[PDB]
């Protein structure tokens, strides 16, 4: 599924991301835009052999099991394929574990490079609300 900007903001809010660990909703919407262009089916393979999955590009080195990343953990206790669902529950639950790991949203490279320090409230502007 390809979310609309406000549709995703609403789904994230419902799932408890607004101000989670102090990150306002616009941060999460900005991170999803630049990691996946709001597409739940996005995948990208990394040079180390791990793959990133879903709307928040969650990595198989640490967080999910895809059966093809030998050095790896599955800290979210889920198949990586679950992160590709039209239902973002699995992604959000895993993202909450990631953001609590010590580096905050810096875990997401696109957030650090494209959202951090910018006017992120613009991402929820106009949404109901």
Where are the chain's structural domains?
1-129
Angstrom distances, CA of residue 96 to CA of 43, 48, 62, 125, 126: 20, 24, 14, 24, 26
User: End-to-end CA distance of the chain, in Å?
Assistant: 22
66 is an annotated ligand-binding site residue = no
Angstrom distances, CA of residue 29 to CA of 50, 67, 113: 24, 29, 14
- Reported resolution, Å: 1.6
Helical ranges in 15-73 per DSSP H: 25-36
The answer to whether domain 1-129 has CATH 3.40.50.300 is no
Q: What share of the chain is helix, strand, coil (3-state, %, to 5)?
A: 40, 10, 45
Would you name the residues annotated as active-site residues? 35, 52
């Amino acid at each position: 599924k390809v979310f609309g900007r406000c549709e995703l903001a609403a789904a994230m809010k419902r799932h408890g991301l607004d101000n989670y660990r102090g990150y306002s909703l616009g941060n999460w919407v900005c991170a999803a835009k630049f990691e996946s262009n709001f597409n739940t089916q996005a995948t990208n393979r990394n040079t180390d052999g791990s793959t990133d999955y879903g709307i928040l590009q969650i990595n198989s080195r640490w967080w999910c099991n895809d059966g093809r990343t030998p050095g790896s953990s599955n800290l979210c206790n889920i198949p990586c394929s679950a992160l590709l669902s039209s239902d973002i529950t699995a992604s959000v639950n895993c993202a909450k574990k990631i953001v609590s790991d010590g580096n905050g949203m810096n875990a997401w490279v696109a957030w650090r490079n494209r959202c951090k320090g910018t006017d992120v409230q613009a991402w929820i502007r106009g949404c109901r609300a």
